[PDB]
Design a protein around this nucleic acid. Structure first.
Ligand SMILES: [Ca+2]
Ligand SMILES: [Ca+2]
Ligand SMILES: [Ca+2]
Ligand SMILES: [Ca+2]
Ligand SMILES: [Ca+2]
Ligand SMILES: [Ca+2]
Ligand SMILES: [Ca+2]
Ligand SMILES: [Ca+2]
Ligand SMILES: [Ca+2]
Length: 313
DNA sequence: GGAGACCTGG
DNA sequence: AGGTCTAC
């Protein structure tokens, strides 16, 4: 039957109470947090969630979900325990209306731009997929990172199911990305120099850092200790380590600084470096810029920057 | 201690 | 192009 829509198979969908002001799929799913979601049908997004294939769509007050179990099982709507994984992925316990109010009460520029861009939250992504997707993000654009990640998963990820002419693949494991000749195979997929960092980082984790448990246990650590620990890996710098902290290690205060953050700080805030004579982007100045937005937005500054990014584009 | 080379679609 | 690394 292929990809389902809300009107195609009514009996196979389950609803989660969720207004559009708490979440907008079209603003978080292709916005550069995850690269493995596709709007196959209008207002219907499909991707891999908790090692299974889901299709999501939202009305005005409900979030409709359906899960594909294939011929292995019988076609049935998602169970209550299955819907809990969807809630955790979107971190629905974090209320956006409250965050928007706190940011708007301490930032006049925030209220003027966030009123039209609501429902911009942050996904809780798996550390493995997040670390390697953003290793490929160096000198890249969203359209190209999406291509590399898709090819990488097709060649090294386990096959799940096939819907229409699409075969969904889970993310590759550490053992697969550390195997022999992985970097040569990845370079034929267009990854460029990033093919070495993927193979090197996967081997450094398994053979020098203690394995997968070392990466996942950075969730318990502090932001400073997790950032320094990530920068050990080859190809992981300050910008990449901040993205993984913010999107996979539950560090909402992480603010990845780049040229986009500089244009916003200078135009909408007249910001300028004071702890460094350098007037442009630099290691000393980029750390000062991250602190400025942490001191101005609070412990959820990373979530606030996601809202300003969606309003700029 | 605060400029290169590295890969590629453009 | 949601930069990192070696070098000096
Ligand atoms: Ca209910
Ligand atoms: Ca898994
Ligand atoms: Ca895939
Ligand atoms: Ca830091
Ligand atoms: Ca590093
Ligand atoms: Ca560092
Ligand atoms: Ca202003
Ligand atoms: Ca550029
Ligand atoms: Ca950006």
């Amino acid at each position: 039957m292929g990809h389902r829509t809300l009107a195609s198979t009514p009996a196979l969908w389950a609803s989660i109470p969720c207004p559009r002001s708490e979440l907008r799929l079209d603003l978080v799913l292709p916005s550069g947090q995850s690269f493995r979601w596709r709007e196959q049908s209008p207002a219907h997004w499909s991707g891999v969630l908790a090692d299974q294939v889901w299709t999501l769509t939202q009305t005005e007050e409900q979030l409709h979900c359906t899960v594909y179990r294939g011929d292995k099982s019988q076609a049935s709507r998602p169970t209550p325990d299955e819907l809990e994984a969807v809630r955790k992925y979107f971190q629905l316990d974090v209320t956006l209306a409250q965050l928007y109010h706190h940011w708007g009460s301490v930032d006049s520029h925030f209220q003027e731009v966030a009123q039209k861009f609501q429902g911009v939250r942050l996904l809780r992504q798996d550390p493995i997929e997040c670390l390697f997707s953003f290793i490929c993000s160096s000198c890249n654009n969203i359209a190209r990172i999406t291509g590399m990640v898709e090819r990488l998963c097709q060649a090294f990820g386990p096959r799940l199911i096939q819907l229409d002419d699409v075969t969904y693949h889970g993310f590759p494991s550490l053992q697969a990305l550390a195997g022999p000749e992985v970097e040569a195979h990845l370079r034929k997929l267009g990854l460029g120099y990033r093919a070495r960092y993927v193979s090197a980082s996967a081997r450094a984790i398994l053979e020098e850092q203690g394995g997968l448990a070392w990466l996942q246990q950075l969730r318990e650590s502090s932001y400073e200790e997790a950032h320094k620990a990530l920068c050990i890996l080859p190809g992981v710098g300050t910008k990449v380590a901040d993205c993984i902290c913010l999107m996979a290690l539950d560090k909402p205060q992480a603010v990845p600084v780049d040229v986009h953050m500089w244009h916003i700080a200078q135009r909408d805030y007249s910001w300028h470096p004071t702890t460094s004579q350098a007037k442009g982007p630099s290691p000393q100045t980029n750390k000062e810029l991250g602190n400025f937005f942490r001191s101005l937005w609070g412990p959820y500054a990373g979530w606030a920057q996601a809202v300003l990014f969606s309003a700029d584009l």
